Amino acid sequence: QRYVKTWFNQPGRKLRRRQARQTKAAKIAPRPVEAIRPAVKPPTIRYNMKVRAGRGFTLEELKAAGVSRRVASTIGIPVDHRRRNRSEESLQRNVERIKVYLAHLIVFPRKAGQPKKG
């Protein structure tokens, strides 16, 4: 029962993180605070009946959904080069996760580079 961890900074850690959320999105307004995560099945027998947020959409999920790896991280769609679709169920649950995302997305135009000649 030596050195103790005492949580008197729990209420101030609650606000420190709230202000960090406030500081972050204020820097990147139009875009959401967080990325979209996929929906994945937990890897056990106690938990395979539930759905939970994944780490990102695999290469094939984005390929069928219509975004390539390079343009999918710009618009905020994390990729997961580890995860892979072993069954058509997970493919369809996450392909139509990006479908609703790409419908609700307003990609603002950037600045182009136009050389004087061709």
Partner: peptide
């Protein structure tokens, strides 16, 4: 209430 004001857009 250090509510950070918005820049960006």
């Amino acid at each position: 209430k250090a509510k950070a004001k918005i820049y960006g857009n």
